[PDB]
Amino acid sequence: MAKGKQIPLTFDTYQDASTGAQVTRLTPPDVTCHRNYFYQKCFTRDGSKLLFGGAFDGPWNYYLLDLNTQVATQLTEGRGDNTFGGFLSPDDDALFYVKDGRNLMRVDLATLEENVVYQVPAEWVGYGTWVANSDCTKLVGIEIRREDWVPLTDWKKFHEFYFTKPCCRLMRVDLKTGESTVILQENQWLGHPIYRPYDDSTVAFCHEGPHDLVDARMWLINEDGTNMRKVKTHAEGESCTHEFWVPDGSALVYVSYLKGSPDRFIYSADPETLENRQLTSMPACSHLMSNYDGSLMVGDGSDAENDPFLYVFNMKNGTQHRVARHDTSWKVFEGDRQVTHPHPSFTPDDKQILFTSDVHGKPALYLATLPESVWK
């Protein structure tokens, strides 16, 4: 294998053991393959091609899978790809991803030629995922001062890091010029910056750290650095997590729970009004994602083997649907703590959900067909 090489994949279709839903496995479970982060574009607009990470060449690299032809083309090569943060451009003509922790790359999908768009400078370390605006002309991301950075290779390191008050800057990068601007810089752990879809003037970001210790999880700031404000004031004992933009940019959605009760709730916040509203209760899930207008949501039942199910929430109906099993082990493969995360999202047609599981050996990609009962 190498950049540009093609491999044919077998698609194995069966019925879910619990729900009877049609499920198709897309990748062979003797090779580690996984989907990207759920909020990053991986399907082309017409739903015919799919970006994923695979280990066929040895390390984990990007591939584009033609879902009609069942051929995967290797997009990137070498040992330093972050195969989770990558996304397709709006026009389906480019892949953006980070190589060697520092180099934000653009890959031309026709030629497979790469260009380095931006390099995190020497005195800083890129943290987390770079996220584009809807126009795909700008990126936001976090850089942490090298002096303050440590490799966060386990959950104890991740826990302790919060108390060090690392110097973090929220960067915005121009994709055409490669120029960078600091939006915000503070001595506290900043994370998950995400442009509001169709509103470049609004950037959401978090205070990373233990859920029950952070002053407030969710923040908004204007693109120019002005008007930094919290999305909500946490009630006593309240944790807020799993925040994401509805892809149409209508609302910020998140999960809320209170110390003393296991119950989880989906909430929505209006970005202009900052009214936060409780939408529905949910089973404990590890992630949450919606379709384009937030009329459907999907979540992956959490580890304690506790809950092997994928749930779909019909937000028009207020109904909840146990649609299929993910059956992931949640185990670490090759040091990576995200690789077995199901990370469900909807196909562009809203008929299927895409997720990772290692149920059949190594991590693989699956598509589960939503039952007619989701829409009654």
What are the residues binding Mn ion (CB under 5 A)?
A: 338, 341
33 within 8 A of 57, measured Cβ to Cβ: no
Interaction between residue 1 and Ca ion (CB under 5 A): yes
* Closer residue to Mn ion, CB minimum distance, 57 or 243: 243
DSSP annotation of 344 reads -
Say whether 343 counts as a known binding-site residue.
yes
Picked from Ca ion, Mn ion, none, the partner binding residue 2 (CB below 5 to 8 A depending on kind) is Ca ion
Say whether 341 counts as a known binding-site residue.
yes
Long-range interactions of 327-335: CB distance < 8 A, separation 24+:
327/357, 327/359, 328/300, 328/356, 328/357, 328/358, 328/359, 329/358, 329/359, 330/303, 331/358, 333/32, 333/358, 333/362, 333/363, 334/32, 334/60, 335/153
Say whether 185 counts as a known binding-site residue.
no
* Closer residue to Mn ion, CB minimum distance, 69 or 338: 338
What are the CA-CA distances from residue 51 to residues 26, 74, 86, 157, 295 (Å)?
A: 12, 10, 9, 31, 25
Among 91, 108, 135, 270, interactor with Ca ion by CB under 5 A: 270
Q: Which residues pair with 309 in a beta bridge?
A: 325
Stretch that binds Ca ion, among 66-74, 146-154, 267-275, 337-345 (CB under 5 A): 267-275
The least CB distance from residue 119 to Mn ion, in Å, is 27
Among 46, 123, 236, 272, interactor with Ca ion by CB under 5 A: 272
Q: Is 176 exposed, middle or buried (0-12, 13-18, 19+ CB in 10 A)?
A: exposed
| Residue whose C-beta lies closest to Mn ion | 341
* Closer residue to Mn ion, CB minimum distance, 184 or 289: 289
Picked from Ca ion, Mn ion, none, the partner binding residue 341 (CB below 5 to 8 A depending on kind) is Mn ion
Stretch that binds Ca ion, among 26-34, 147-155, 266-274, 337-345 (CB under 5 A): 266-274
The least CB distance from residue 112 to Mn ion, in Å, is 28
Q: Which residues contact residue 354 at a Cβ distance below 8 angstroms, ignoring those fewer than 6 apart?
A: 35, 42, 43, 50, 344, 345, 346, 347, 365, 366, 367
Say whether 334 counts as a known binding-site residue.
no
* Closer residue to Ca ion, CB minimum distance, 270 or 334: 270
The least CB distance from residue 276 to Ca ion, in Å, is 13
DSSP state string for 47-94 = S-EEEEEE-TTSS-EEEEEETTTTEEEE---SS-B-SSS-EE-TTSSE
253 within 8 A of 240, measured Cβ to Cβ: no
The least CB distance from residue 4 to Ca ion, in Å, is 11
Q: Which residue has the tokens 């992931």?
A: 328
* Closer residue to Mn ion, CB minimum distance, 42 or 183: 42
Q: What is the x/- site pattern for Ca ion, positions 33-62, by CB under 5 A? A: ------------------------x-----
Q: Which residues pair with 8 in a beta bridge?
A: 71
Number of residues that bind Ca ion (CB under 5 A): 5
* Closer residue to Mn ion, CB minimum distance, 217 or 341: 341
Interaction between residue 374 and Ca ion (CB under 5 A): no
Cβ atoms < 10 Å from Cβ of 334: 11
Angle, CA 187 vertex, CA 186 and CA 193 arms, to 5°: 50
For residues 201 and 268, give the distance between their C-alpha atoms in angstroms, rounded to a whole number: 20
The least CB distance from residue 287 to Mn ion, in Å, is 6
DSSP annotation of 350 reads S
Interaction between residue 154 and Ca ion (CB under 5 A): no
Point out the annotated binding site for Mn(2+): 287, 338, 341, 343
User: Which residues are near Ca ion by CB under 5 A?
Assistant: 1-2, 57, 270, 272
Point out the annotated binding site: 1, 57, 270, 272, 287, 338, 341, 343
